[PDB]
Amino acid sequence: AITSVDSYLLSEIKPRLNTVLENCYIIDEVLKDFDYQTRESFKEAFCGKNAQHEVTVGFNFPKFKNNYEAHYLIQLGQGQETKNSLGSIQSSYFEATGDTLVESSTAIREDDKLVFTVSKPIGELIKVEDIEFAKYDNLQVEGNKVSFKYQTNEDYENYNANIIFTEKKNDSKGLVKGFTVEEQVTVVGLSFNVDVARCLDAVLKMILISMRDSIEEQQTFQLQNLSFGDIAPIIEDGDSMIFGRPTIIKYTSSLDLDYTITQDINKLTFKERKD
């Protein structure tokens, strides 16, 4: 599973940043240490549902003009290989598996079992929220749905559960070959007003903190490290300077490829010899 850190960063940042800027309480919590003036100015400009001004995020070298009132700029940076396993072997799988999904699913009644439906089939069930099925419940997964004994659990006929599971792709089996890569990605906020840049950097730090609970980087992009540069004038040739403070984010991910195996043994030929 080749990793595109930049796209993941963008997808995590955009909705999360919009949600954070949606409400004032979270912003006030974030900007507790800042002075009244800059805090209130940033809140007036960008914060709130009905904010007239808006921030943006995008990759570097855009052929079009880019808004320099407040923008998050991303560039890919360097990368390095840090650790390897014997034969480049990372893991072995019997059934092809895709991404790990989290889905909410209300309990349902079936003639012998309570069940939960899901969007897609199941390759493996990791966890059901606040449940530890015993032998009596006889937890079974049958494609799309997971099921447990009806009678002794009948109080929970409409349990508002949620599920963490894994997609199923194929029944084939193979080996995972790959290594670990230690990658650096640079993120910088741009603004002709330095105070806006400072507040933007603080918001960036908070959303990076919040991201650590995300499933994907919990499973794929562990060992997050941060590093901040100095406030510098990005450009001097305009009528007014652009000010930005670059930040460097580090991640560790496992670049890997699935090598299928067609060998399947189903018969044995134990015979003696004579001389």
Partner: protein
């Protein structure tokens, strides 16, 4: 009066940017100051 008007374009990682030099000459008795602002309604500029 205005001369040498230039629409100098710099293409960078942040994006494209319009900046250039234009040399002007005033009337008598007028004392301009740093970062004064002028606007020419007559002349229109294309942008995309």
């Amino acid at each position: 009066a205005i001369q040498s008007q230039e629409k100098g374009t710099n293409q960078l990682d942040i994006g494209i940017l319009d900046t250039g030099t234009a040399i002007g000459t005033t009337q008598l008795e007028k004392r301009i100051s740093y970062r004064d602002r002028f606007t020419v309604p007559e002349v229109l500029m294309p942008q995309q």
